[PDB]
């Protein structure tokens, strides 16, 4: 992997363990949470290389994602390639951009605008891009490039990347996750 960055945003709301040199991490939020966490492992600068992962992920009670997650500095954007998830589909509610096919499934693609919300520069206004896998799974390869190229026709800057990680996020309910990046 060449993992050089640990993502920890409110990981203390649950039990986050990781080992950078093995590329593994776990997160348990068995009791539930009612605030947002995002944890995981990755690289201080994102790129379009494929990511292969393997996970156990149990969050059917939970507003949660298992996703490639990362940011672009300018135009400021937060992005997700959601491989599996719980009770909430961000594309149910956001503006639809269409569909992309990659790595064995279609993904619905959507975007949203967040105003004065926490971001890599503090509090600011940014765009979100989502690809949500139609056949959810917890192991495989994500050909990031196919998503970036599709989003780029819709304004995604597709360069000037900040961090990028394989992540678990939850903001409600309980669940459990253990992930290896290969």
């Amino acid at each position: 992997a060449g993992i050089n960055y640990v993502q920890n945003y409110n990981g203390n709301l649950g039990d986050f363990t990781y080992d950078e040199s093995a590329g593994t991490f776990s997160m348990y939020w068995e009791d539930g949470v009612s605030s947002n966490f995002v944890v995981g492992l990755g690289w201080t600068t994102g790129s379009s290389n494929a990511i292969t992962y393997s996970a156990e992920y149990s969050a059917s009670g939970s507003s949660s994602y298992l996703a490639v997650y990362g940011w672009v500095n300018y135009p400021q954007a937060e992005y997700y390639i959601v491989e599996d998830y719980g009770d909430y589909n961000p594309c149910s509610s956001a503006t639809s951009l269409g569909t992309v096919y990659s790595d064995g499934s279609t993904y619905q693609v959507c975007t949203d605008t967040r105003t004065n919300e926490p971001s890599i520069t503090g509090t600011s206004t940014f765009t979100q891009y989502f690809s949500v896998r139609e056949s959810t799974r917890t192991s495989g390869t994500v050909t990031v490039a196919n998503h970036f190229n599709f989003w780029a026709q819709h304004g995604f800057g597709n360069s000037d990347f900040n961090y990028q990680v394989m992540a678990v996020e939850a903001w409600s309910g309980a669940g459990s996750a253990s992930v290896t990046i290969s």
Side-chain angles (χ1 to χ4, degrees):
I3 298 308
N4 64 13
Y5 168 76
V6 179
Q7 160 76 2
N8 188 332
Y9 175 76
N10 301 328
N12 58 32
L13 306 176
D15 186 17
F16 176 43
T17 312
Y18 54 90
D19 178 343
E20 305 101 293
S21 52
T24 53
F25 74 89
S26 293
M27 172 72 160
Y28 299 88
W29 63 109
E30 293 307 24
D31 303 340
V33 294
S34 57
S35 192
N36 187 224
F37 73 77
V38 180
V39 298
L41 290 175
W43 299 276
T44 53
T45 297
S47 76
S48 69
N49 294 315
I51 298 168
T52 302
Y53 68 100
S54 189
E56 300 163 34
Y57 173 71
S58 185
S60 67
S62 196
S63 302
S64 177
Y65 304 134
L66 173 66
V68 177
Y69 173 71
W71 279 82
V72 163
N73 295 308
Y74 190 72
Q76 199 179 65
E78 177 184 46
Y79 60 80
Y80 293 79
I81 298 158
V82 181
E83 291 290 278
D84 199 357
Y85 59 98
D87 66 25
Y88 177 75
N89 180 332
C91 288
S92 273
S93 154
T95 125
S96 166
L97 300 183
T99 289
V100 73
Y101 186 87
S102 203
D103 305 294
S105 162
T106 62
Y107 278 80
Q108 300 145 75
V109 181
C110 66
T111 178
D112 203 359
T113 298
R114 307 265 88 205
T115 62
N116 318 299
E117 284 200 12
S119 72
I120 43 160
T121 51
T123 288
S124 66
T125 291
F126 54 98
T127 305
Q128 290 185 308
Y129 294 87
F130 292 95
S131 292
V132 182
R133 195 170 172 101
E134 209 106 61
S135 308
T136 62
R137 72 188 172 159
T138 66
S139 152
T141 294
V142 178
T143 306
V144 171
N146 286 341
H147 293 277
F148 279 5
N149 290 336
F150 187 84
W151 299 340
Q153 281 159 11
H154 293 283
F156 175 73
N158 203 18
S159 60
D160 200 9
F161 300 109
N162 202 285
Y163 71 77
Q164 183 187 60
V165 293
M166 190 75 198
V168 178
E169 168 162 15
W171 57 104
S172 137
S176 159
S178 159
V179 180
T180 305
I181 300 165
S182 151

